[PDB]
Amino acid sequence: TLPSTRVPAGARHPIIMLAEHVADTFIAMGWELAEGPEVETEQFNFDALNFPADHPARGEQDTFYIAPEDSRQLLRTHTSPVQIRTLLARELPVYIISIGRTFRTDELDATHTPIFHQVEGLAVDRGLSMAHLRGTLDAFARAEFGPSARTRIRPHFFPFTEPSAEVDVWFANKAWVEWGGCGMVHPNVLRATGIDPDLYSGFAFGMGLERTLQFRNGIPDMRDMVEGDVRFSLPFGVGA
Amino acid sequence: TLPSTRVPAGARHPIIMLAEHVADTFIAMGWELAEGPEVETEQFNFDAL
Amino acid sequence: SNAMRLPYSWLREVVAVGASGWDVTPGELEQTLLRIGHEVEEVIPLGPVDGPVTVGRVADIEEIRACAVDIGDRQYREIITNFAVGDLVVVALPGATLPGGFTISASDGMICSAAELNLGASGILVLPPGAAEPGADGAGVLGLDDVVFHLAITPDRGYCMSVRGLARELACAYDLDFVDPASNSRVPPLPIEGPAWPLTVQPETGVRRFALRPVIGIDPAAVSPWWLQRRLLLCGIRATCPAVDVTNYVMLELGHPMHAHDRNRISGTLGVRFARSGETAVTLDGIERKLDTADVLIVDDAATAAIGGVMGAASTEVRADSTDVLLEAAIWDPAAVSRTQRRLHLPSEAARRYERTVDPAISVAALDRCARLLADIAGGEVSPTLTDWRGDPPCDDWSPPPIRMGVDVPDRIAGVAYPQGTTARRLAQIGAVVTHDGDTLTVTPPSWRPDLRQPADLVEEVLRLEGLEVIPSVLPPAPAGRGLTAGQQRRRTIGRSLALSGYVEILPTPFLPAGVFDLWGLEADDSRRMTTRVLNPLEADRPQLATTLLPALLEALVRNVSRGLVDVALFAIAQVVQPTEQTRGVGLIPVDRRPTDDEIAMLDASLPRQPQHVAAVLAGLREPRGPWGPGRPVEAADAFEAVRIIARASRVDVTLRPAQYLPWHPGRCAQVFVGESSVGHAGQLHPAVIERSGLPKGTCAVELNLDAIPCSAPLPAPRVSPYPAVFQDVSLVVAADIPAQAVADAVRAGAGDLLEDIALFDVFTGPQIGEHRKSLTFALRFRAPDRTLTEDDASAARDAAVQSAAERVGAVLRG
Amino acid sequence: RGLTAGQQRRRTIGRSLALSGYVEILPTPFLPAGVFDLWGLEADDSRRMTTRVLNPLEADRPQLATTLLPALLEALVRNVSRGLVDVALFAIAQVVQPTEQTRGVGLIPVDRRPTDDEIAMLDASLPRQPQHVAAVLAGLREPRGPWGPGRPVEAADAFEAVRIIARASRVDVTLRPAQYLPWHPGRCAQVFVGESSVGHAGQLHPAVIERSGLPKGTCAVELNLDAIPCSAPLPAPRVSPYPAVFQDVSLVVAADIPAQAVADAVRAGAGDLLEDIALFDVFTGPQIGEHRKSLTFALRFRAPDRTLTEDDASAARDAAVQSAAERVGAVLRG
RNA sequence: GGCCAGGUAGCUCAGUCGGUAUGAGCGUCCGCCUGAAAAGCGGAAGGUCGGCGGUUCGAUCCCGCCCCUGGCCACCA
Ligand SMILES: CS(=O)(=O)NCCNc1ccccc1
Ligand SMILES: [Mg+2]
Ligand SMILES: [Mg+2]
Ligand code: NA
């Protein structure tokens, strides 16, 4: 019974492991992964995503902008520009998810962080409906929250989707919990990528990983998820 | 440039890795992986086929 | 600024005009608003109170005040600063429990305010003369059975910033008959017997409509009735005077913000124009504002009257002695109002509604509603004059362009076969004109719905009213995907390998610590210094982006060491930001088409280089102590082994060469190479960098560029030889500077294909070996593929290795 | 739905053992001739109940493997006999463990689907075939080099192979002394997941090594993967911002007392303040009585809401010593 | 944006309106002690008291803007 581990194992980060489990879920459903730069042009971050010119999120208060002023260069407020690039670079149909680092202006406390990771999905094909969106979200929820998991969508607004919706999730391991947003890809986004809206329809969705891991495991302080303390990563195992 | 590997890395078997690559290929196309016993009844190995 | 508050009683009242007897549970209404796309933030009931909470009149004050109050039935109780004699006040007589357990008792009670009554925000609550008889029930007079709804209105539904919009939405959801409170068919509109006031509008300023109608001879001592003041407080607006209360009340009721000017303080023709540079304007709040050339103003022959759609000025401000009022009903440009109100920080109730567009068709109707309501409560005379500027040429139809879409398009998008006529009914329910032509509908949205521009907008309206719950969950047919790319798979293998070797992964921050490169002692021309700056960082001393992952890992290393965890091994896999020029962005590309590949390449070229790196840091004990021994401290070779671990994970061969590269120790630093390309560095950090950074002694670090490491797909085909091997050792003496790998390479070159394996197991200096020299002993294993070797056969290949080592690294056989 | 939890765990175990220095083989189901006679197993040993092949390619190898060790030891001899004396092998495959004599099932007509009872009957007539992970080691565990002469294989290396598999499976295991051939009865640990036995590990019996032509000090491990439950833990670590207190405690116990039992007793008494415990010394010098041993653990105390004092930490340490005295008869070193 | 309260050792925090923060608990080091430890006992090390400046022989403590901290008042056609 003597200790025998001369080299104690380390730990991959839980957000990276959760991202890997989310990726494997969509790979198993025929989707693929795409990447993009974290310093993105304002063209792909707002303009191509049907953001109006006087949108409040384009301001200096909610978006990290690259100096000097009016450089049309910023830290991305979402992984959506990664899917704009894939829509421009790949042939149809497209079934991709993007898992990358996202930069918002929120201060770092127990339930917020300026630097967080989110998963965004994008499917563009002939005859995609809200039913296909809801079907994908339910498979996403079942893989991360258990067999009894189910999603609920309520109408909302997003500049790049129409109709738009917020996604709530139900998991019995402990009610409904706000999870993310989704909707059918706006036709202006398709014409901005050279796609005929009369022949191709599509849906998209977006959930933050730090948010998902928080209420799924009951993590009290999200500062422990980003500050790199060894006491937080080790209990999650190695992750091989 | 001195050797630094005090514990030399091993190796998974190539057949196992080839099987893993074949499995990932079909799983990437929505397929799934099944299992079965090596000692099988003649009903399933011959008669049902 | 995004909120919208209104009490349930007011909302139900407007809905009940068309649907008599309509009334729902506050929870049921919350679910209906949520289901149709209105996010409620809070559902606040009013009060509650119980016992003796009654209304009374002040008898006389004896001053900190002390006054007797008629509590009704000729009963008087004395209680002990913005009220005189005769004001109707609310008292909490002994035996009452205010909201929050606050029980009143014997001063024969307590004078109540809107604060502790859970009714508003401020002094004490004063009821207007004639609001309630002294002695009436306070809960019934204040209407504490009401419920205030706090909603977060999305920017695409500016029409819902009013009772008119939300009442229409509820009538849509409950399939009710709706009476628009902004229509003409209730009381006939006011007469138009000539111009009301001369005005000139610069057409290039964005105004779509500008209406005026005066009300003459109002009572300056008049006060707004209680039902009007109460509804303003529940919506978050404090009462002031009848002329102002009606402008805010109508803004809340119909969504068209109104403004009241003093007609006796307007000098000449009113003018709408852009503001000049450096021009100022004393606003209504008494605060001087600096204006921009892109700001719309209202001016006359003297001073500035108002900031277009933001806030009126003090020049024409209504005061306590105002008797002649000129009411303004304008439609400003949403973009111009948004730019103006955000530049000077004025999230006005009018500005928030103007940037979300306001229905231009109701300007006169809201103007007549406001004018008749002011004269009713203040005893004024509505002048039958009206100025109605509606652009040049004057616009008489404010309807958006028609929209064509298939009748079953919402059915396809939703994936539900809605009953026949569902689409046409829902689009007509929200106020649009719908005509048929085969299977194609032609929909003309109403003037208060500028967000409806293309078929997708109409689909949202049909779906959200039918309810998204009816949409089924259908997994789409999976495409035949290719799985993970080689690089994505490789980053998993690297993470798994480093984790199983004892490293803990962190998520690195891209904001470099303050003066990290000065702590490292880098030269001014170091490529890592040429960073990308952030204009608005959360820490002003950390604006630069990360050109290297080590500063973030070293920051997490210090965090662990400073909290008791002194034996740490961390790693990270993330991208860096490396610009090759000053920050340069490309102009706007038209969004109505696909950008060409030259424009896409222009966007990529304008962005800094962002390659993905892998890095690691080590400190303290690499191997812990236990029953086996005392452990082993971190040394430079542990960082070199981390390189080998990453290399084996990548299935590529690396070579290390001595190098001088800060922040590494110059005598303990290696530059990693794949083939002939440099991919990073590793080793022990410089002691000066460690001392200046507050790092633990002996800290080691690694950083590799994964994108510089090429992906490999080796197909080995080894042939196992059944014949025995020959074991021999060779001792070679070389200069101290000669790398041990270079000697092993030279031995392998001369030994030939008989050499099956070679391993170094002894580095010996000392008295037998000359100065600045060293002896290396390698273990050799020879094996033939087709025969058994003799001892002389192996010695020949060994001697050939000695000669190869002699002519390549100057080795001398140990004697 | 992708890979199952068992198929995913089978990969993680393989990656972990390979990254720790083990080389995978493909074990053959046909047992070597008289392998259980070399192991000295009793005639009633359940491993002897094997399924036999009617027409094998070698008439002296008709029986199917009830354990993976004979195939691994055969590959171990092949490597050592050919110049590769420092070897660590592992295999993940199924065994054939019949629970009765060979009983067949008559032909079910193939013009229809077999009923669920007929499918269950065909499964019951088949021998049990659980999935096992096993490994063998001999020679040097760590090679020699410019750091030193290397370290030979010892029983603790097989014990660590269990913990490598346990961490890959994300389960907690306990090792308990046991006697079970072909292992060394004084260097054999039985592996438990909770209170369910899943296998054994340690050094092989020297008589088995002699009769089988194996290298001296050969170690082995075999676990039943089907007996280990698939786990999906959801940790919620709470990192305390308050400093820690470091103390060491030295306990004298009987020689037969397992060091893990002492640590469990110390952990149970210390309470929630105990953040980490680690054994770093086992002393049996002259000042320690015969058949006794001194154990010194490094304790780390930390409160979640306050900074501790040495008296607060010593209270938990003294409470740990009392628990150690009650559970394993420990005496504070003096 | 006009007033406050606060940033102090490695961690968590007290505390001073000028020459010593005789700083606390824990963390670090040495000695007695032990085979080696820890506790205990007896000794120490370590802060430029948020940054840049302005007054004095002398400034963490005294006026001038900022880094970023949670809170009041004020403003709210
Ligand atoms: C709290 S959030 O940042 O994760 N919201 C996610 C919204 N993104 C989104 C992405 C595609 C489609 C619709 C919405
Ligand atoms: Mg929301
Ligand atoms: Mg819409
Ligand atoms: Na070295």
Numbering used by the authors:
A (entry chain D): 98 to 271, 276 to 341
B (entry chain A): 98 to 146
C (entry chain E): -2 to 60, 68 to 84, 88 to 113, 121 to 135, 138 to 831
D (entry chain B): 498 to 831
Provide text from the study.
AaRSs catalyze the attachment of the correct amino acid to its cognate tRNA which then is used in protein synthesis on ribosomes. Phylogenetically phenylalanyl-tRNA synthetase (PheRS), belongs to the class II aaRSs, and it is a dimer of heterodimers (αβ)2, containing two α- (PheS) and two β- (PheT) subunits. Structural studies of PheRS have shown that the α subunit binds L-Phe and ATP and is responsible for esterification catalysis. At the same time, the β subunit is involved in the recognition of the cognate tRNA molecule and editing of mis-charged tRNA.
The protein-fragment interactions were analyzed using crystal structures for five of those fragments complexed with MtPheRS/tRNAPhe (DDD00107555 (D-555), DDD01008876 (D-876), DDD00805735 (D-735), DDD00079004 (D-004) and DDD00067116 (D-116)). The FMO analysis indicates that the sulphonamide group of the D-735 interacts with αArg201 and αGln158 through strong hydrogen bonds. Also, the aniline nitrogen form hydrogen bond with the αGlu217 of D-735 fragment. Synthesis of L-Phe-AMP was inhibited the least by D-735 fragment. In the present study, the 3’ CCA tail of the tRNAPhe in the αβ heterodimer bound to D-735 was translocated into the editing domain, revealing the tRNA conformation during post-transfer editing. In one of the αβ heterodimer of the MtPheRS/tRNAPhe (αβ)2 complex bound to D-735, clear electron density directed towards the β3 and β4 domains of the β subunit was observed. We modeled the 3′ CCA end of the tRNAPhe acceptor stem into this density. An electron density that may be unambiguously attributed to the terminal A76 of the tRNAPhe was present in the deep, narrow tunnel that forms at the interface between the β3 and β4 domains of the β subunit. The D-735 compound occupying the synthetic site is separated by ~36 Å from acceptor end of tRNAPhe within the editing site. Our structural data of one of the αβ heterodimer of MtPheRS/tRNAPhe bound to D-735 provides the experimental validation of the water-mediated hydrolytic mechanism of ester cleavage in the editing site.
